[PDB]
Design a protein around this ligand. Sequence first.
Ligand SMILES: NC(=O)C1=CN([C@@H]2O[C@H](COP(=O)(O)OP(=O)(O)OC[C@H]3O[C@@H](n4cnc5c(N)ncnc54)[C@H](OP(=O)(O)O)[C@@H]3O)[C@@H](O)[C@H]2O)C=CC1
Ligand SMILES: O=P(O)(O)OC[C@H]1O[C@@H](O)[C@H](O)[C@@H](O)[C@@H]1O
Lengths: 535, 534
Amino acid sequence: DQDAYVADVDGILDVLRAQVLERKPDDIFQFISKSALSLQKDRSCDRINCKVKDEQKSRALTIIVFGASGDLAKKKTFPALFDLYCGGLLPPEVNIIGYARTKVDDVEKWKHETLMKYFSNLSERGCHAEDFLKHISYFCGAYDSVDDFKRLDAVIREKENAFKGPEKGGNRLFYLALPPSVFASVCESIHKGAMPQEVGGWVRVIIEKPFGRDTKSSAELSQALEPFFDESQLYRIDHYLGKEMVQNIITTRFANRIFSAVWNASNIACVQITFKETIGTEGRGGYFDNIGIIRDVMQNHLTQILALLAMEKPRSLDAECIRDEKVSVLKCIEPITKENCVLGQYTASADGSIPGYLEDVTVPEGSTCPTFAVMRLNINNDRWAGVPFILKAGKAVEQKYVAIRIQFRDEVHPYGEATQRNELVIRAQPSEAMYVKITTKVPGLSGDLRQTHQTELDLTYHTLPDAYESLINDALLGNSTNFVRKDELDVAWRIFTPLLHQIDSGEIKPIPYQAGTRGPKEADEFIANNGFKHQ
Amino acid sequence: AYVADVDGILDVLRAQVLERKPDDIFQFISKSALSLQKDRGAESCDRINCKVKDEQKSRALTIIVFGASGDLAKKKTFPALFDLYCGGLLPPEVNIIGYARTKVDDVEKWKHETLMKYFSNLSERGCHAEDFLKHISYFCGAYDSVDDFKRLDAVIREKENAFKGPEKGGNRLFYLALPPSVFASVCESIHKGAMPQEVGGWVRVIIEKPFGRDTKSSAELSQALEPFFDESQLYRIDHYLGKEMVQNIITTRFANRIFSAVWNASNIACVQITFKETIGTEGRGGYFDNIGIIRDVMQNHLTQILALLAMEKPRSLDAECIRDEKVSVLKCIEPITKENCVLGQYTASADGSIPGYLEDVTVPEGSTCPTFAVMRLNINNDRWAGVPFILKAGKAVEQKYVAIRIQFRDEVHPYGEATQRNELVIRAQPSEAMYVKITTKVPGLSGDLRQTHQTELDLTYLPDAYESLINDALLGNSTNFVRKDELDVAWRIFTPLLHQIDSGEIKPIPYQAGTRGPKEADEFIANNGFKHQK
Ligand SMILES: NC(=O)C1=CN([C@@H]2O[C@H](COP(=O)(O)OP(=O)(O)OC[C@H]3O[C@@H](n4cnc5c(N)ncnc54)[C@H](OP(=O)(O)O)[C@@H]3O)[C@@H](O)[C@H]2O)C=CC1
Ligand SMILES: O=P(O)(O)OC[C@H]1O[C@@H](O)[C@H](O)[C@@H](O)[C@@H]1O
């Protein structure tokens, strides 16, 4: 026959084909030619050794991703899982199963084209993807069928008992890449049929960002999940808590005495946390019309950043005392009122390239949901009294940008106008950076030592995986330091719910602004009145 | 032979990598390379940059450099004046004349080979070198002859009378590039014969160190010059006060609340001011033997840096406000004791390349003179109580650099052994640099959270400092000149220790050249609040 050689030839054609779809229009005639030509010298080769702890290899692990046909598992969950295999963090005998109600004609065509198509670029690393796909299986069934979960458990129990390790049984990790409405039925089916083998093994369930839309809707949803799983088993991922630069916030603050001495109201004059984004709704205005920018990236993302910035020192580095301070600081904030808020809704841009938010057909006529929102929070405690906290977010803005911008009070004496406010910036995207801006005397001889200029002490990028998989590694370790807790969720909703009821009741209206600008100019007038000085 | 030039440029890149920023070396070599191109742009000697104030040109100006044939005026003073002319800072009609006892033949030949030979190595680029020499002149005479000053006054009066401006009279700046013992006679000759013309002008007198060798001998010297000139007219230069990084110490502290909030004993755990030099005495041992390193670079240079670091905030940037705070902070310092000192004296290197300090022919055998000295100072005020202040200076050591190294108190509880002390480093030589060291999470592993690594926040942004001090004296900005009350109080801090080392109560510890110093000195640094480690 022609043994073994077939696997190498098939391992080429699937690699280009995923790039052909991502390359998209136009004609693919040249795309096949030079990409394989680039691989000739790209062709590692040593199998990556397991960096995983010896304790994790003691007994079997199973990873079940519900909604494998869903948009999140395709573009994010599974591609993140492949990234962990390249790092060796997965045990060698790991078993992955994709669960979805959709019928699948043939799994082998499906994994080669529906899942690997979103994989991270594989010109230097594509050969390892073929070995990775052997671990993946697929399981068709309903999310509410206790019978199918009794059928799925029989499949997991075989590989759990086939494991080659001193310990027996199996740990299980479920990833609910599902709409929130489906979450309750799945955990019921897991509790009635998918619980770990009695001989041993733990269970943990990851759930996705949407937790209702107000303080009451989120509270009952967690109440629905209480009977089936406790807080230690639930892992409410936030997209940003796994980010490198924001995990540094707990270290940049407390590990350094210089920052801790000035992290108080006596020195800090203003704090702002912006989430700027140049994209519009991208034709999915109805998917965003029911949300709004406040609950999309402000109640969840910027609030988690504000919690890490304003939290009191944890008693230890244990995950819960860190999260305990994250909740205690959020309880000092009185709920936002409409006087402290400014909304915006992007219109057709002067370029003519971006249709206005109302120009999209999916958006209901007369919509007042905000595409832009700047607001001030007020922390009532001895550390942060009187200090503005300006949260800002918006789509279709002048530039893609998310960063912190603390601004310390300047001491006008002696220098007066020769000096200005110090500020510490912590940027996460487009690129990670941190720097402190200060005034220093100019090198030229000048005179009176008054010829000064602003100067920054840039961190010099002292030294990969996206936060979606970095949190996946934390759930595999059981750390849970970077996952939202339910008490942390209820207080974050309480800050915004009274304001969210007012915008839903029409008491305030968005301010129009055409796309590609900074936003409504009233928002800049609002930021100027809340402690933001600038050069 | 055509290929030889290329090899040298790459070697200077090697030194910067080990010196600082020893992380992600790939990108570091790139940015350091482009900066070297601007180190000399080979700018054409076309226009002259006349940035000097027009009001400085309003009246005739004259500069008198006594000892013009002397070693200091030959290699530094006159070359510095040429750089100020290349910078355009001198008035177009400026007159400078040299004073020395020796008679000279063919004076135009003398400056062309004895003085221009030591001009800055920009002379290949300095097209107007001989044009600058036309302002120079020579004068032979005694330093104590009031008659020679009365004829020197007639020469200056002629050049002052040739000035072409509405203002009358002439301004006069005397540079005493002379041993200090001559200073009492020169100022007496200036007073009785060389004072500025009555119609207008001003007089200013630059004097060089040593400013005595003890508190009383310094007070005798200042009182000897007291009748002839006031403090506003006297300018006691210190070589370091003109350097950019130390002038920035006042700006780094009080212009920024961040440093201002932590510049106190609540946050500062230790302070170190180090002066290291690979160079040995190198055959000139006799002149250093009666001085010693304590009064060579510590009582003057390092003490001036310590005053700028610990001084209370001036009420204003006026020059007198800064010196006033410099004296009050020094008054809180109790004089150094013999227990707070460890002396050293370098010997022949293990390779034998640099001869030992006693191998030099000039040094008397058995000398107790120190080539090395580490000391602790104790400031006693609400801001600096209990914080060690470690001064250090030494010749023929492992490395040539001078830097400040603050160490902030470690925050133990949040991370335990995962973190360490913060540091703020301010180096001036070999190259200017400032950076603050901090602990940050190391990117990579999602868990642990105790995994951290030290990192620096480097600052990111030619008239040499000797020229800047002369320009400060011409402009009347006395901010960078030690005052009389500032000087004698600095002597009182050191003299009781200086009387002990002269009396032999402590003697230098031998140490081989090219090492950090005596091993006893390092444990003394560890025993007085220093604790930086990997
Ligand atoms: N995806 C993205 O780009 C982003 C995601 N998010 C948020 O993360 C969350 C991820 O949700 P996501 O998976 O992307 O949304 P999807 O709507 O794409 O997923 C729906 C999945 O659940 C199944 N499902 C639900 N109800 C039914 C039903 N009656 N009948 C059959 N199938 C049903 C679907 O079919 P089947 O069961 O057959 O598989 C499908 O697989 C979202 O809430 C989103 O707000 C945030 C930022 C970006
Ligand atoms: O919120 P966004 O637009 O998805 O950006 C998230 C990503 O932004 C990138 O800059 C980071 O490298 C990733 O760690 C991060 O996941």
